Paper text:
Despite the low sequence identity of < 36%, the structural homology to prokaryotic and eukaryotic NATs is quite high for the refined GdmF structure with root mean square deviations (rmsd) of 1.5 Å for all backbone atoms compared to the structure of MlNAT1. As has been previously observed for prokaryotic NATs, and in contrast to eukaryotic NATs25, the C-terminal α/β-lid terminates in an α-helix positioned away from the deep active site cleft. The low crystallographic B-factors of the β-barrel and α/β-lid indicate fairly rigid domains with average values of 24 Å2. However, differences in the amino acid composition and their sidechain positions, particularly in residues 72 and 74, are found in close proximity to the catalytically important cysteine 73. This leads to a two- to threefold increased active site cleft with a volume of approximately 700 Å3 in GdmF. Despite the high resolution of the crystallographic data, there is no apparent electron density found for a major part of the interdomain region (residues 194–206), suggesting a highly flexible, mostly unstructured loop. In NAT structures, the interdomain region has a largely α-helical structure and closes the deep active site cleft and the catalytic triad. This altered loop region in GdmF appears to be a unique feature of amide synthases and contributes significantly to the widened active site cleft. Given that the native seco-substrate of GdmF is much larger, the wider active site cleft and flexible interdomain region may play a critical role in substrate binding and/or catalysis during macrolactamization.
Amide synthases catalyze the formation of macrolactam rings from aniline-containing polyketide-derived seco-acids as found in the important class of ansamycin antibiotics. A key enzyme is the amide synthase ShGdmF (hereafter abbreviated as GdmF), which is not part of the PKS and is thought to catalyze the release of the ketide chain from the acyl carrier protein (ACP) domain of the last module 7 of the polyketide synthase. The overall folding of GdmF largely resembles the common architecture of its NAT analog, revealing a three-domain architecture with an N-terminal α-helical bundle (domain I, residues 1–88), a β-barrel (domain II, residues 89–185), and a C-terminal α/β-lid (domain III, residues 211–257), the latter being connected to domain II via an interdomain region (residues 186–210). The catalytic triad (Cys73-His111-Asp126 in GdmF) is highly conserved with an rmsd of 0.04 Å compared to the catalytic domain of MlNAT1 and is buried deep in the large active site cleft between domains II and III.
Numbering used by the authors: 0 to 193, 207 to 257
Write the structure that this text describes.
Amino acid sequence: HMFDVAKYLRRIGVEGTPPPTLDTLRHLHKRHLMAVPYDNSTAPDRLPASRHLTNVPLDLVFGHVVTEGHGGVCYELNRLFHTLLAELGYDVRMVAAAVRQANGTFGPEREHTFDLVHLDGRTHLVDVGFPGPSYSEPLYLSEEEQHQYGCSYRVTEHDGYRVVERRPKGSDWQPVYRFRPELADPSGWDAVRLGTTFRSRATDNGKIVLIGRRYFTVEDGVERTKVLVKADEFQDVVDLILAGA
C-alpha cells in the first residue's frame, strides 16, 4: 500500500510517534533490526529491468516489507528507513559503502546503501539493512571507541574513506565496510543504480545470521558459529530469523 508511518511503526513494534531525539533514533534502529529481517531470497524478483532504483516504486517495497511482513536487502530496508526517519523529522543523508570481503579486500565502491543522520550537532550512522554482524544501534561518526551489547565499534579514517570496524569479545578489530562521508546526499536514493542466501536479524542482546549453512550468533559480545547439517534444524533457524522479535 502507500507508505504510512503509523503502519510502519506498528510493524516494528514502536508505540505512538516518538519525538525526534537521539533516544528515539536508537530505539527505532534497534526495533527495526529486531522486527524486519534481512533476506535476499526473493530480491531478484523485485529488480527493475532498467537497473535504476527509482523504477522500483517505494510502495512496492513498503508492501512487501511492511504490509506483508517479509524481509529485504539493503536498498529496500535502508530506503524505507530513510523515508521513515525523514517523515519523523530527522536530517537523513544517503551514503554508499564498499563491503569488506572474506579475502580482506573491499568490494564494489557503492554496493552497500545506508544512511547518516545529523542531529544536534553530531552525525550518526544508521544501517538497518546489512546482513552480517554489525551495529544494532546507531554509531557516532568518530574514531572514538563505542560499545554496545558487548561489542566495540569505531569509525576510522583511511585513504579518504571512513571505515566501520567491529571488535567482539576475544577477537581483533575487523572492518565491516568503508565509505566516503562527503558523498552523502539527502536525495541519494534517487541516484542508486542496481546464489547464496543471506538472512539475519537482531535479538535483544545481539544478532543471529544465516549465510548458506553458516549460522552465526552473538549474545552480549560472545560469538558462536555452527555449519548446519540437518534439514529440520536449518528450517528451524530460518523460521526463527524470519519470525522477528
